[PDB]
Design a protein around this ligand. Sequence first.
Ligand code: DCP
Ligand code: QPJ
Ligand code: MG
Ligand code: MG
Ligand code: MG
Ligand code: MG
Length: 326
Amino acid sequence: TLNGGITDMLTELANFEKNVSQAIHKYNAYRKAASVIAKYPHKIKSGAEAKKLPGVGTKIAEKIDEFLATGKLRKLEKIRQDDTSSSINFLTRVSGIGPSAARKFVDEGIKTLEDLRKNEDKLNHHQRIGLKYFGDFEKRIPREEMLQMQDIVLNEVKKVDSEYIATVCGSFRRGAESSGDMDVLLTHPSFTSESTKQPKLLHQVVEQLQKVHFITDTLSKGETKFMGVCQLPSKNDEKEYPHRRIDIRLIPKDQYYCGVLYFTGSDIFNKNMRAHALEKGFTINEYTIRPLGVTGVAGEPLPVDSEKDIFDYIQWKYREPKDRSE
DNA sequence: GTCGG
DNA sequence: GCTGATGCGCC
DNA sequence: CCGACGGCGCATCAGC
Ligand SMILES: Nc1ccn([C@H]2C[C@H](O)[C@@H](COP(=O)(O)OP(=O)(O)OP(=O)(O)O)O2)c(=O)n1
Ligand SMILES: *CC[C@H](OP(*)(=O)O)[C@H](O)COP(=O)(O)O
Ligand SMILES: [Mg+2]
Ligand SMILES: [Mg+2]
Ligand SMILES: [Mg+2]
Ligand SMILES: [Mg+2]
């Protein structure tokens, strides 16, 4: 609601920089500005008011002044009218089509949904599945369906080995009423930072979920990360549920707190927290928090016994998952 | 595009 | 076959 | 002004 006009404007500029300009730092700058404006609890009355927030500079203030006076941004009005920008912005909505592949396809005269379904032989495995479920993948998952999905995954993993722990992360763990997809963090005692005492720990879980027809497709799979497609079972005479994206990440059992911090997000929160860690002389990834030596070389992993320990190292007050959303 | 040294 | 670069993905 | 901007997994390809 509040400042929705401004944040939508900034998100559309971010998407343009990422998809068309291939300018990843401008994309990140627009998104950081959109997120700080979304959390601001007043109706922004001027560019000058917004410029006081961290991540809003001169250029964004000037665009906020235009938007508030005219309800439009001339630059976005032009981009919307541009056939190449339009085509690329549409193709990048297909899972597996990034900015580079989108520009290549536009060059070959492939620029609509009809063009893609004619040219499937030109798509890689991932792109083919993104095309097949194009409609399904733009739908959000109601929390009630996420609870049904949680119950299937936790119960199936438990049937494979009572020592697995599966945790639903992403927007679900931040308490969202709807989720873009299902993100599952997996641990097993056999996989630690010190040892892999067992092979196929991720594979055996994927296989069981395929066997009860929950996982329907694979986009990618290695030893620690699965990316694919799943679907809730429906009743007699009921319309089928949409196909959903599922990500599964197997994390060393001893590095759970770093792993769950990473997988809980949001992505903007992780970028902000990791950028703050560097200013405080630390580096954070999904496994460890490590000091930076005078060098700029990461040192030994610091002890972590809680999510909050990570916040304490970088001198942040703890934020509950619910308070890490945009 | 913005920030901090 | 291996290794390093790049694309696309995740939060 | 100007260098840095988060960090890493898997798929794919060029060069040896
Ligand atoms: N054809 C080019 C253009 C630029 N550069 C280099 C020179 C500078 O080190 C840097 C950018 O210089 P610019 O004059 O482009 O500076 P800005 O990017 O700030 O200005 P502009 O508003 O023109 O983008 O890239 C280059 O090597 N070859
Ligand atoms: C939004 C205004 C732009 O800020 P950035 O460094 O992307 C520039 O001031 C205008 O640049 P252009 O419109 O992309 O040439
Ligand atoms: Mg996309
Ligand atoms: Mg998600
Ligand atoms: Mg996901
Ligand atoms: Mg915790």
